[PDB]
Swiss-Prot record:
The keyword Signal applies. Part of the tripartite ATP-independent periplasmic (TRAP) transport system SiaPT involved in the uptake of sialic acid (N-acetyl-beta-neuraminate). This protein specifically binds sialic acid with high affinity. N-Acetylneuraminate (sialic acid) can then be incorporated into the lipooligosaccharides (LOS) as a terminal non-reducing sugar, protecting the bacterium from complement-mediated killing by normal human serum. Pfam families: DctP. Is essential for lipopolysaccharide (LPS) sialylation and serum resistance. The keyword GTP-binding does not apply. This is Sialic acid-binding periplasmic protein SiaP. Its main location: periplasm. The gene is siaP. GO terms for biological process: transmembrane transport.
Length: 309
């Protein structure tokens, strides 16, 4: 309570994100000897992630989550993190952010231009596609009214596989699916579980199309005001929570398919070759729009070996 701080997020109280944010909050309170208390504001109470990023910049929110890909809003080449099928796995996502010149520069700009400090990175699952009718092949996407978040890379995913995208906020999705205003949505399995989308979607297709990370972000206005020993408490707690965050996602990912089958969901495994083929002209458009910066980021990312060594 010397520092009453706030951590906003789109995820809800049943989510892995929230569980790991609770761990972070508990560690910070303990190790700051009570000087800092972090309260959680889930379910987009404060707005969406675009809004919460603005609040961190302004200093009116202290902590939030965002993907590396979400920074495409300021630096177009950062969409590389969510070009479908480009990032192979989380090992690549980690090296793309921390071990490339592109990623290192992005982190610096976040701090210097956007007033946000990157404390840690976790894995947030690989997106799959749920729907009210089977997706047995890419043909089934044609005219599927597929909800997407308000993000260019997801809108593109939907466009290029032949679906009819409808952007809407995460908070509005469950109702849209339940009323069949849309036919499907796409998110990692842990979100399908957390938001109970499986109650209102009969089918799950393993499209494996976009890999999400999650960054623990702090407003510079807040971080700069903490004495350095408290900065260290926050940084160390964010790193500890991110490892736990990743583990919740990794441990659950395979098992969740069983969980959904038991809830009555039918699982399909469409041939992904035509999905990946369909993205070829999108990668071309990305390079055309983002220029040499985008080409360079793609090359640095494609150079990363996806196997742990
Ligand atoms: O609305 C969604 O389905 C969601 O997955 C919810 C999740 O909490 C959020 O981090 C992401 C993110 O906003 C997009 O992937 C664009 O970066 O969107």
């Amino acid at each position: 309570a010397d520092y009453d701080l706030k951590f906003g997020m789109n995820a809800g109280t049943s989510s892995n994100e929230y569980k790991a944010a609770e761990m972070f909050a508990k560690e910070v309170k303990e190790k700051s000897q009570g000087k800092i208390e972090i309260s959680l504001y889930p379910s987009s109470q404060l707005g969406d992630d675009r809004a919460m990023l603005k609040q961190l910049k302004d200093g009116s929110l202290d902590f939030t989550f965002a993907e590396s890909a979400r920074f495409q809003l300021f630096y177009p080449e950062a969409a590389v993190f969510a070009l479908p099928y480009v990032i192979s796995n989380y090992n690549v996502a980690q090296k793309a952010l921390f071990d490339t010149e592109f990623g290192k520069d992005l982190i610096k700009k976040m701090d210097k231009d956007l007033g946000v400090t990157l404390l840690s990175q976790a894995y947030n699952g690989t997106r799959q596609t749920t729907s009210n009718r089977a997706i047995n092949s890419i043909a089934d996407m044609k005219g599927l009214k597929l909800r997407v978040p308000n993000a260019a890379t997801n809108l593109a995913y939907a466009k290029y596989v032949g679906a009819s995208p409808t952007p809407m906020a995460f908070s509005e999705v469950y109702l849209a699916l339940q009323t069949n205003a849309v036919d499907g949505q796409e998110n990692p399995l842990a979100a399908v579980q957390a938001q109970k989308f499986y109650e209102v979607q009969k089918f799950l297709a393993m499209t494996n199309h976009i890999l999400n990370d999650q960054l623990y972000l702090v407003s510079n206005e807040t971080y700069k005001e903490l004495p350095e020993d408290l900065q260290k408490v926050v940084k160390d707690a964010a790193e500890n929570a991110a490892k736990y965050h990743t583990k919740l996602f990794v441990d659950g990912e395979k098992d969740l398919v069983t969980f959904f089958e038991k809830q009555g969901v039918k699982i399909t495994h469409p041939d992904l070759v035509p999905f990946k083929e369909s993205m070829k002209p999108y990668y071309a458009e990305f390079v055309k729009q983002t220029g040499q910066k985008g080409e360079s980021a793609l090359k640095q990312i494609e150079a990363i070996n996806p196997h742990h060594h």
